Amino acid sequence: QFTGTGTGGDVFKVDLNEQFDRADMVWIGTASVLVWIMIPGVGLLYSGISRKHALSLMWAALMAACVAAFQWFWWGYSLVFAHNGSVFLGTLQNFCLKDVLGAPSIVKTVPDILFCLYQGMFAAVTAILMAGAGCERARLGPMMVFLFIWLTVVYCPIAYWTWGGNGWLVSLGALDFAGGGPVHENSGFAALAYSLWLGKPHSVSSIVMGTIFLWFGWYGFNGGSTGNSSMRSWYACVNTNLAAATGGLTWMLVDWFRTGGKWSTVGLCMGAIAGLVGITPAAGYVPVYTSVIFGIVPAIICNFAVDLKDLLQIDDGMDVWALHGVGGFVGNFMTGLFAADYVAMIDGTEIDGGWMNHHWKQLGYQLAGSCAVAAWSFTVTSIILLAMDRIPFLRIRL
Amino acid sequence: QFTGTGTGGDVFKVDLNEQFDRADMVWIGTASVLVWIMIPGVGLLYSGISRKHALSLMWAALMAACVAAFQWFWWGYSLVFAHNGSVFLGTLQNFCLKDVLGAPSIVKTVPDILFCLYQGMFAAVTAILMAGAGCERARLGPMMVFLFIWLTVVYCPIAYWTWGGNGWLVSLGALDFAGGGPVHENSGFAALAYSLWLGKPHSVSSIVMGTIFLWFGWYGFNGGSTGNSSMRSWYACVNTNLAAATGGLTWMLVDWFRTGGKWSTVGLCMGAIAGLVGITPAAGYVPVYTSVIFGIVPAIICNFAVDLKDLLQIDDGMDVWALHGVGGFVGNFMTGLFAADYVAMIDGTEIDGGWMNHHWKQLGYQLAGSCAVAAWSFTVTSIILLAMDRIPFLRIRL
Amino acid sequence: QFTGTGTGGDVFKVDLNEQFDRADMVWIGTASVLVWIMIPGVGLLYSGISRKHALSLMWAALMAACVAAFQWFWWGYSLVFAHNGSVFLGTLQNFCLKDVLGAPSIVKTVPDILFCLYQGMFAAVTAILMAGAGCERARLGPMMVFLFIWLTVVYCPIAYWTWGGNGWLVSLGALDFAGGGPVHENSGFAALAYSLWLGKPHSVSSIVMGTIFLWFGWYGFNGGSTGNSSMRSWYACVNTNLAAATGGLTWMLVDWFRTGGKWSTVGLCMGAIAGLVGITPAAGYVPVYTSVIFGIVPAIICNFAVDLKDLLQIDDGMDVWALHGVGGFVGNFMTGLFAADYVAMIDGTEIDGGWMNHHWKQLGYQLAGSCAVAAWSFTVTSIILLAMDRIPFLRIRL
């Protein structure tokens, strides 16, 4: 009968669905289809935000969704969610997704095959936050090749450290809810390492149109990170939703001060995105009133984080870092403060909490991951893209 | 254990999810994310329909989603869905959403926190049907301030009267399914009171693109107003869907008569919207064949309701009234006729019915709400926006 | 109590929801709203792909959604899903959808009313793959009339043969999962019979924007064809997803060979669509590794199937045939090879399998349907559109 290892059993002998709640499954099923639409969210958002462009990266978002898919089929999933992995990376147990079916996943409440589906949507949103930085006059052929390799040696380590069975941040005692680390910091600082070595209407709608796609999709992103149809799912959604509100209102007032009384529509659009990123690691852990702080604080810190566009000049890919890499860090910190064991308990999840319940040690744990993440995302991103220009016919930039 | 008041219990002592069906919850969770995309539906639809514009209100739709969020966080939810409210308005019991978690809501079949999530999406669609009327050369700063106040003293009373615990239309005996009153009539007649005191391709796609967003989202709007995963949910969806069909076919034939044989693509787009609004208050109460009538009738009555664009001239915000304010009334009336106690009974809902089962008195009850609504939405909208121009530096229009 | 015929019982005497899983229902409910957005997917995709156009068929997609709705209300549903049908067509038992409520449908695991909702979304996507071929300087009035008749005598027979109670392909032993036959082949070869008798940026985004809508929506299309919240739903989604990946990667490499090293963004967009169509009939039956083949093979065969644009010249509607009619056939064949009884068994579905388990006879059965389909879709499409130009005032083309 139910073995809990491999495919979990004989389809001819046992009903593998009996292990799971069909409502928890239905939700993550929905949630899966919602994260995907965040890809042309990045595309439209960063296409429309570019002040300089080689190729409409709204189309180059579809390029990532084919590449990320095949890598994640190939060995991507295995390296993050295998049941026998080390502690730094998983195994290759599931190469080309064989024996991925009915066993409970590293989230015990959905099967491997739906958790492959839903977690596969984060390596793909990461992919377009990556290609999106290095789009300017970059070659197309080697680009795809970059990504495949980058997902393998940069994303997958970080992901297994955060979400993976015997990962070392899970076991340390660090909280990361919907993956600010694996997705925003990973891609915020690997976009920095492109803009150091390989470094207005008629395009406003494309930001906005693009912005809206992301706001919409994050509901599947955060709300479906609870892993079940429970009411913490919907809780995190109330949180997500208003970090994005207070995020975007804050960011509009701030340059309306710093710059006389400057009109800024693209302001509010980014304030939202500043707040969504800022709440990712905390959406299922922090009290609702405190999720306004997660709106405010990363909008401010990221506003000034953009004004570092002139005291070092460079532009191609600092927009990604300005929001996701900073805003992730800011939010991964703030988790350590407001993470409350009594919000976590709404689906029974046991954590020690953060400062909200005098678990002082937590805020340290939180700094442990962000630094490990940022570093790995920078050095190992760096080694590959230098060694990538090294060979002529596999370009990157010109 | 389960107390049914406050947060409903101790997360450390009881499992608060046991009260609810995880499938009813999953659905309204989905449905919630579907109503949201109706906001840039209005935006794109009314931006693209404007014959005259100050600022792309497709972006000014995102402004409403930040403001509506914070107001609804602040005191919005409390005023409509508090468990101890008077009969004209709820209490302030839930200021800044404290003690909103696991108790059954005024819809007993979902928790306060998911019902905050899903019902919060109607105050936000209302918000953009509001700002959307008064967009023309209006100031941005005071605009946000308008809305906040308008949601508080105009929307929230009407909403608590229709949906609220001890509201007086619920207790009277009036049927309103997905809220034609609180959302369309409220915003149809408050858009009239702007165009009295403060009163083509290359923009066709934006109507269409915008139209499509709404048709798509209404499924979450109406279908998720049943409050459960029951098969009345999907019933109302079959209704919604074809009121929009027959709505839009009717509206295309009609000016194809009145105007020689005039081509009208924007016709069909509005006929749909005419029919969606016309079925909102009735989608869960009326037999499917009768939902064609709800397509037809409000398309006609609203077609002529547009031709009042010349026998009084004014334009800025009559498009909103032409569809949602008239079409709501037309549909709130027609509910009283075709509301059938044996459709309501598909999830066990007990009503007296409408004329379909000789409950003659009903059609009166239906007129009681629409008039109360329309009036409150007009007078109290009026007092504020006059007293709003009154002070210089908090403008509205110029 | 539960009678299983008619409306299934007395709403006042029995709870009709008890027959069904509220999670299976919730999903197909969601899935229903996902297939709909595939309509402006076709629209945007084929509008943006047109090298020649009379009227933005992105708006002419909304025309189909009104017409398809009313026909399917009228007699459409009845002809395909009636419980007493012959073997060639169902009955008229459910004319104007009376007595469609709580009985299990021809898929026993959802009620007639939700199965009307969800299956109604395929006759509508078919509708826009139809009108979309014959859009070029065609008249609008008679167009609607065409469709209504075409859905009735062409779509509905094919559909009842594949999905219908006593259909003859179901009973024969043929596998068709999400309906490559009824939807793609039906509309691939009926688009051929228009282009025989009645026969670049600034429009790239519209392909892409349009492409994305379809990729997104297919999850509801294929994943919701399992009919339940089971984990085969999500399985088929993993399949769908990567047939579209490997589909679109293949198609980009291929003209990057055939044409020197030609840049082709519209390539990848179509490769995806080539792969989605290629996996439709197989998504719930074939092993995941084999779903890469379904990506590759129909991308190649359909690439060359486009290069028949010059060795016969004609264009208006060969793009539809190039993808859906060929790609359907290619995929309906390949089902017969890789259909495995042990994937089908994941929700207990009993099939004999295909060649994967030495059921040699299968591949024949598979050819039986595709040919029957293609033929009926051609001859009967032909008779009507010739006899349609026959009468002056009901034009088609000029």
Numbering used by the authors:
A (entry chain A), B (entry chain A), C (entry chain A): 4 to 55, 57 to 203, 218 to 416
Sentences from the paper on this structure:
structures of the Mep2 transceptors from S. cerevisiae and C. albicans. function as ammonium receptors/sensors in fungal development. a central channel for the transport of ammonium. non-phosphorylated, with channels that are closed on the cytoplasmic side.
structure using data to 3.4 Å resolution. region bridges the CTR and the main body of Mep2.
